[PDB]
Amino acid sequence: DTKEQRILNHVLQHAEPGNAQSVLEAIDTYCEQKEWAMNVGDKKGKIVDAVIQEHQPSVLLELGAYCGYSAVRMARLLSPGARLITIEINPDCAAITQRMVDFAGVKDKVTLVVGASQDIIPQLKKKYDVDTLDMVFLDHWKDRYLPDTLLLEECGLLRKGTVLLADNVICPGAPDFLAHVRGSSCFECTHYQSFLEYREVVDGLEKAIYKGPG
Template identity: 45%
Template sequence: MTVQLYLRRSSGRSEMVSPAIVLAFVPLLVTLIIRYRYHFLLLYRAVLVRMVLDCTTGISREERAFQYLLTHSLPGDPDSILDTFDHWSSRVEYMSNIGPKKGKVLDRLITDNTPLTVLELGTHCGYSAVRIARGLPLGARLYSVEMDECNAAIAEKVIRLAGFDDDTVELIVSPSEEVIPQLRERFGIERLDFVFMDHWKRCYLRDLQLLEGSGLLGKGSIILADNIIFPGAPHFLRYVKSSGLYQHRIHQATLEYFRGIRDGMAELTFIGTK
């Protein structure tokens, strides 16, 4: 018996579509599934699982992560906080922290450059704030900016659980585009030695230019921007390469807690105008 498939047009007539045409798309579909299997897995873990757990537990993913930290980590021990967070994000419920592998680049830059004044854009739950703060020299201070009040509340608890007080890590709850122009007048900052960007990727270029305009970047100031390949910040990268204001280096990596998705970080050193 011949199999016949039909498409109905607006005129009311039906036209037969050969099964061979439909079957011709199967290899393409299979190829796409195989090629982007890690992206489908990320969608499942980061979105679908989160939605289900949000409904069944009645609390946010960030609050679930903090509860896990409370019961599985050692208070006052930053290393224990980070290790527990890494286990949660890789084995329990996915969360897009910088992670241990890319985190080593951040650790090295903090250790080698001993910055005294650090700005973080995008605190989220406080993972990277704890990672930065544990490597800072005595007397240094981290200003961490988070626009989401709920995430900031969790981050505050995580940072304090790790043992850092307000003198070491100051959490600023406000959009980055409002905070950056106020850093000099409101917080008395004359120069930023180190900036870590891990907020909305579409804001990277805007906020970099705001930092330039504020006069807070001095010769040798370092900016480290995460996720510049995935989800990606192409306009930011083009500007950095063409502006003549920075020496730049791309650290190739994979997405945090996902081996199959290519990612990277951009390390910039401000050299000023030529």
């Protein structure tokens, strides 16, 4: 992950220590202009922000951390005592994520777990003291969105009103997830049309609110 280290080094050299906004701006400018990277980004980040502002989650699970952009972005909006648990399968990306979170001033809100989402999710109650989740941000490999959604449900981690928010439902796309949550009476869905981070290709997020196993 040479590019990812470069992004981190750019942030460490140019952003302001302890300042989450400064970190996000440094990443977004670097990535838009110099080296594209799969961060949720600023435009779609504003939709993520709005969802968190509307629903005010205190326990938030992120699937897929990468360099920590979205962890920093979401953590900046959370109340005291809130927990953002973020799961990242790649140890080198997790290491960057932790540096990024520490530098941004938000480490006290974030718990990073190195591992595959499908291994970690069944451990969240017993090993991470989770009860249920208020919100989940899905932004890992898209072929995991549907299986992890069903796993979350099976493991008893969703309550009525738990908000799923999925990135990239149009590009690269998550068609099997979308078909499921839209067609299922167990999820109330809203689609937010936007763009591929840093670019003009159309993309979107799906917000799917769990309605219980009905």
